[PDB]
Amino acid sequence: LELRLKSPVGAEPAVYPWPLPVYDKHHDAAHEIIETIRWVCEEIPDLKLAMENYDYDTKSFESMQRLCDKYNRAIDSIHQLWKGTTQPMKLNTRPSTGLLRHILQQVYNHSVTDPEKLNSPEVYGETSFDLVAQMIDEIKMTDDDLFVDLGSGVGQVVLQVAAATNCKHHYGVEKADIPAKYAETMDREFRKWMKWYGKKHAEYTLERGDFLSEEWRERIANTSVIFVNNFAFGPEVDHQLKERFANMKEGGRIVSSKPFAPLNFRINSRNLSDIGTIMRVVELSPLKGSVSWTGKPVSYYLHTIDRTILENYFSSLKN
Ligand SMILES: CN(CCCNC(=O)Nc1ccc(C(C)(C)C)cc1)C[C@H]1O[C@@H](n2cnc3c(N)ncnc32)[C@H](O)[C@@H]1O
Numbered sequence: 001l002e003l004r005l006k007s008p009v010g011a012e013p014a015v016y017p018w019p020l021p022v023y024d025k026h027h028d029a030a031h032e033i034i035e036t037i038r039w040v041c042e043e044i045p046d047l048k049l050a051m052e053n054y055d056y057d058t059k060s061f062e063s064m065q066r067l068c069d070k071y072n073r074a075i076d077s078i079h080q081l082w083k084g085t086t087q088p089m090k091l092n093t094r095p096s097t098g099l100l101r102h103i104l105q106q107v108y109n110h111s112v113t114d115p116e117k118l119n120s121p122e123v124y125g126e127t128s129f130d131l132v133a134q135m136i137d138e139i140k141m142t143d144d145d146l147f148v149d150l151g152s153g154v155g156q157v158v159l160q161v162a163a164a165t166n167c168k169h170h171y172g173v174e175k176a177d178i179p180a181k182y183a184e185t186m187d188r189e190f191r192k193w194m195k196w197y198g199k200k201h202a203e204y205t206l207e208r209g210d211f212l213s214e215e216w217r218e219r220i221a222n223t224s225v226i227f228v229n230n231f232a233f234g235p236e237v238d239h240q241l242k243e244r245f246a247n248m249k250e251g252g253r254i255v256s257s258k259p260f261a262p263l264n265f266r267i268n269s270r271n272l273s274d275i276g277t278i279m280r281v282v283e284l285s286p287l288k289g290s291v292s293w294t295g296k297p298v299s300y301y302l303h304t305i306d307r308t309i310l311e312n313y314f315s316s317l318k319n
Contacts, residue, residue: 001061003033003068006075008040008047008089009198018061023109030058032106037071039099043197044089046081050074092200100163101129103193104156111185112154117178122293123232124153124179131300132160132227134287135255139302141165141225148173148220150211150228150241155183157227159190162204167225170204173211180208212240221247231257231292242275245305252305254279259301267313277313280304 005014014036020029034056041048051074057063082088095103118124141147145167149157152172162170174180183206194201209216220226221244230238242260254260261276263283271277286298 003064004072005033005036005068006072007196007198008044008075008078009091009196010079011196011198014196018064020058020064024115027105027109028058030064032109033064033068034058035102036106037067039102040071040197042096042099044078047074047078050077089198091198094201095163095194095197095199097133097164099197099199100160103163103190103197103199104129104160107159107186107189107193108154108156111189112182121232125157125229128157128229129160130287131290131298132157133164135227135284135300136161136164138284139225139253139255141167143168145224146222147171147225147227148223150226151175152183152206154179155186155206158204158206159186159201161227162202163194163199166202168203170202171223172204172206173209173216174207175210180206212237217244217247220244222249224249224252226252226254228254228256233258245275245303246278248305250305250307254303255284256301256303257298260303267309277310278305278307280306280309 001018003016003018003020005016007013016029016033020033022028037051041051051071053070054067056067112118143166145165146169147158147161147165147167148171149161150173152158152174155172155174158170158172161167172183174183187206211220228241230241238258238260245254245260259281261274261279261281263281265274265276265281267277280303282302284300284302286300290298292298
């Protein structure tokens with residue numbers, strides 16, 4: 001006993017057992033099915049027309065099977081329309097944000113079956129989707145860039161960014177054995193679903209490793225965009241990263257939850273070896289409604305490597 005959904009681009013259908021599993025208090029497979037059908041109507045305007053007719057009894061097998069069947073047969077109809085003069089769906093484009101959010105929800109739920117082994121507090125960043133999205137809007141990125149998430153967890157922020165941007169490569173690095181294991185599954189599931197919807201992504205890799213290691217020094221030195229959720233790192237790790245940041249090329253960016261250099265920073269003669277000297281540090285606007293683990297309106301920081309701040313001080317003395 002089963003329900004199946006045909007891929008709009010000929011990939012292996014998606015197959016769900018019945019009764020349909022529940023994922024957590026707020027997500028189940030019924031609604032995964034309903035949403036998936038609606039995003040595919042958004043990809044294909046003709047399907048929207050044919051499907052025009054749709055609430056459903058998610059508990060009733062045959063009320064669900066009707067919806068599936070009506071969806072599968074309209075897909076057949078559509079592939080037939082592409083055999084004619086009509087042109088196939090613009091293939092290897094990138095997913096809209098709405099769709100990406102659905103996809104990453106799907107991938108997670110198919111990959112992290114026991115979310116109980118991920119322990120009370122927010123240290124892995126579960127609903128940071130919108131946040132990363134805002135960040136992706138502000139920090140323009142081009143095919144010249146390299147991106148790294150430092151302490152990449154199960155991998156969701158690497159996948160979101162690789163999907164959204166066109167950097168020449170996207171890296172994630174994780175130290176702990178459990179999430180690196182989950183990240184292997186996440187990577188699989190993501191590739192499969194992205195094919196299923198017929199959507200393109202940038203190159204990305206999910207590695208195992210310590211970002212404080214010797215190999216990672218010059219790796220960090222050559223990365224142009226670094227995302228780092230450093231809220232729970234503690235003072236010693238911050239200090240080590242600061243060192244590694246000193247070797248970064250000009251223009252390099254660092255976006256974080258805690259600042260690595262003060263906002264009010266005027267160079268004087270007692271602070272000459274501070275990282276402050278080599279970087280611009282702004283505070284970014286948070287999203288109305290998001291809160292930190294301290295029940296607190298959040299705040300985030302953009303650091304740009306700009307050495308001309310220093311050059312200027314070695315002229316204010318030649319004055
Ligand atoms: C932060 N990270 C998991 C969160 C998943 N990724 C994010 O949240 N990225 C992210 C999210 C939001 C933002 C912004 C844009 C600031 C909002 C920027 C980045 C913690 C992981 O770091 C791992 N970790 C600890 N120290 C480690 C070490 N030295 N080397 C390897 N990994 C280590 C630790 O095991 C844990 O899995």
